Amino acid sequence: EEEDAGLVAEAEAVAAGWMLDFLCLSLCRAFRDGRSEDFRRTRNSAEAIIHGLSSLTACQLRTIYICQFLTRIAAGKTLDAQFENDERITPLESALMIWGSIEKEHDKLHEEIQNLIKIQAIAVCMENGNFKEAEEVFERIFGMPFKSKLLMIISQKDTFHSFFQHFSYNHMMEKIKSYVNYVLSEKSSTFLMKAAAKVVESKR
Amino acid sequence: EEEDAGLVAEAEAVAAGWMLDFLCLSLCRAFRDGRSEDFRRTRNSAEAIIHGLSSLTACQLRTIYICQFLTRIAAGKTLDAQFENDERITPLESALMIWGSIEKEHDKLHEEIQNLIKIQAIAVCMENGNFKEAEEVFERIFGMPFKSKLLMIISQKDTFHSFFQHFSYNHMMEKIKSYVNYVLSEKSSTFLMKAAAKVVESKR
Ligand SMILES: CCc1ccc(OCC(=O)N2CCCCC2)cc1
Ligand SMILES: CCc1ccc(OCC(=O)N2CCCCC2)cc1
Ligand SMILES: [Ca+2]
Ligand SMILES: [Ca+2]
């Protein structure tokens, strides 16, 4: 009776792990495709499954970090969203913290995404007329030539500066989608998706 | 590209169906065991997965009805919970509506559970001092000898009447748990649980 209960709990943990990988893959695909409503609904399912998991492997923590990173990027222009206990941290600042914590290679693409999130974290404040908040985000992030241009734009209150058009929100999204394509290729072979794909193929 | 997107969506529907059955089995087990917090967390996961499913088979609708029925029974004493668009309907009345909609045999146990939910739907109002609400629940449900005793208890404001101790909330819960055991036996062979169980067994 107690051994049965324990074996059932172990099986529920195995199934939750399979469900987390599948939901991460669905979330990545919705982000890549721009399917806003599917992303919202999948994020809700991923959060609920995560609250039912206790012990995590290094791989499951990385998968969770990727889900959290994409959620903050999707909410990057929503300055009323509070993702951290410190209410001053903006969504792109929260995405930057996660980006620097994921156990992943620090290749050229990693650094390009990092710097585009930093510029846009300031740009989104400027675009909403939040000039003092842009200065505070700048101080938290920066924590020389790149830093100096940003402080100049902030002090001029140059909301639609040409610098923000060369390192735009769309360019940040496109670089992030390139990274998402690599996660989709790596997780396409996860148990639930493979089994579901085999079922669909066998009926064709 | 469009055929690939369509095949991916079909696989996501297959996986969501497997996830719904697994979450129903986990929800049933938490209800049977009295694991209140696991029931709450599993209900959250089941609701989110359900919102990501569009077309349902007759079997999936029955599985969803069972999840909804157990949620209303678990909230039976929570008279501030509103499960229907009509705010007057109490949680046990909402459970009674679902019980009469499930495609299932109407054996002796089905009717015993039905009548215990009817008595308790009135009993829970009386126990909270809501005498006028008990009369209104009575009129919505009833909709001869059984009906007459209840109307007499309601009019006397006999909160802790002996009739409610013979057909108690605990007796209703125990009869419902007997039914839950049959659902657990029928869904223990679902894809995700079987595969998870095989993994756990292979490591023993
Ligand atoms: C957006 C997806 C999401 C993910 C997790 C979460 O809460 C849990 C949480 O933060 N951790 C921290 C990381 C390890 C798991 C527990 C809420 C929402
Ligand atoms: C408690 C579990 C739960 C289940 C379903 C749900 O909403 C969806 C809903 O009602 N239907 C009606 C029945 C068919 C699916 C759509 C909310 C919570
Ligand atoms: Ca804010
Ligand atoms: Ca009420």
Question: What is B150-183 written as a DSSP string?
Answer: HHHHHHHT-TT-THHHHT-HHHHHHHHHHHHHHH
What is the resolution of the experimental data for this entry, in Å? 1.9
Q: How far apart are the first and last CA of chain B?
A: 44
Q: How was this structure determined?
A: X-ray
Q: How many C-beta neighbours within 10 Å does residue A150 have?
A: 23
How many angstroms separate the Cα of A92 from the Cα of each of A97, A128, B184? 9, 14, 45
Selecting from 3.40.50.300, 3.40.50.150, 3.30.1340.30, 1.25.40.210, what CATH number does the domain B2-142+144-202 have? 1.25.40.210
Does ligand 1 have an atom closer than 6 angstroms to the CB of A70? no
CA–centroid distance, residue B125 to ligand 4 (Å)? 9
B51 with A41: Cβ contact below 8 A:
yes
- Cα A132 to Cα A167: distance, rounded to the nearest angstrom: 21
Secondary structure of residue A90 in the 3-state scheme: coil
Under 8 Å between Cβ of A44 and B51:
yes
For residue B3, give the 3-state DSSP assignment: helix
Question: B160, B168 in Cβ contact below 8 A?
Answer: no
Q: Measure A87 CA to ligand 1 centroid, in angstroms.
A: 17
Structural contact between residues B92 and B176, judged by C-beta atoms closer than 8 angstroms:
no
- Find out whether the beta carbon of B72 lies less than 6 Å from any atom of ligand 2: no
Residues in chain B: 204
Nearest to B7 among A10, A26, A200 (CB): A200
Helices (H) and strands (E) in chain B, counts: 10, 0
Mutate to test the pocket of ligand 1, among A68, A82, A94 (most ligand atoms within 8 A of CB): A68
Measured distance CA(B85)–CA(B81) in Å, rounded: 12
Task: List, in order, residues 6 or more apart from B38 with CB less than 8 Å away.
Answer: A52, B26, B30
Q: How many CB atoms lie within 10 A of CB A38?
A: 18
Q: How far apart are CA B158 and CA A102, in angstroms?
A: 63
Q: What is the CA radius of gyration of chain B?
A: 20
